[PDB]
Symmetry: C2
Subunit: 122 residues, 2 copies
């Protein structure tokens, strides 16, 4: 019977989905125009206190960094992948002046919003 292994695989696919989704949100927070919207509460952006939004901006540069040719593509993806992993783990480990746990909570606010469903163009 093929029911048990498929449930675990269904969950593993789901985590990958959540990761790519978190990536989609943060990659957009890298953009200057999106940041201003959150800074002023514009265009359906959910309200965040200024320091809370700053955590997400600093963290996005780690998950979605610009290329560093000092590292191999493999070593930089390894660095980036760990940030996604530890975010979803949501441990109390410190990162960017806060915790992976706190960032995960904030990202759930952002995923649950509708600002990213249709993103405004500059």
């Amino acid at each position: 019977q093929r029911r048990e292994h498929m449930l675990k695989l269904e969950a593993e696919k789901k985590k990958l989905r959540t990761i790519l989704q978190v990536q989609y949100v943060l990659q957009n927070l890298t953009q200057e125009h999106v940041q201003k919207d959150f800074k002023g509460g514009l265009n359906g952006a959910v309200y965040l206190p200024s320091k809370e939004l700053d955590y997400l901006i600093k963290f996005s540069k780690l998950t979605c960094p610009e290329r560093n040719e000092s590292l191999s593509v493999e070593d930089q993806m390894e660095q980036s992948s760990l940030y996604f992993w530890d975010l979803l783990e949501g441990s109390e480990k410190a990162v960017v002046g806060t915790t992976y746990k706190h960032l995960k909570d904030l990202l759930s606010k952002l995923l649950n919003s509708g600002y990213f469903e249709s993103i405004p163009v500059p």
Copy 2:
């Protein structure tokens, strides 16, 4: 318990490795969406490895699935479900049909491109 904990230590390492591999494949495919990179691969112009015209065409088509443009008919969550599955089945490398070839064949081609070192430093237009 130390057999409970070593086995568990091994699975996390395997999961972290797979996620890294996904991001690498994503970096490659996302870059193949670009016109100028495609011209390099059609020839041998900047260290691009040789690929026959149909095989490279498989990669270009597959990249639009893994790295699609936004479809507002679907929620972001629902478009990430479709998109993520292309990454999963690629790593699975089964004989299942996709884009006029198989996931297994695409995985082999993608391993050539990762190993080519073309992507270590990407040339600017």
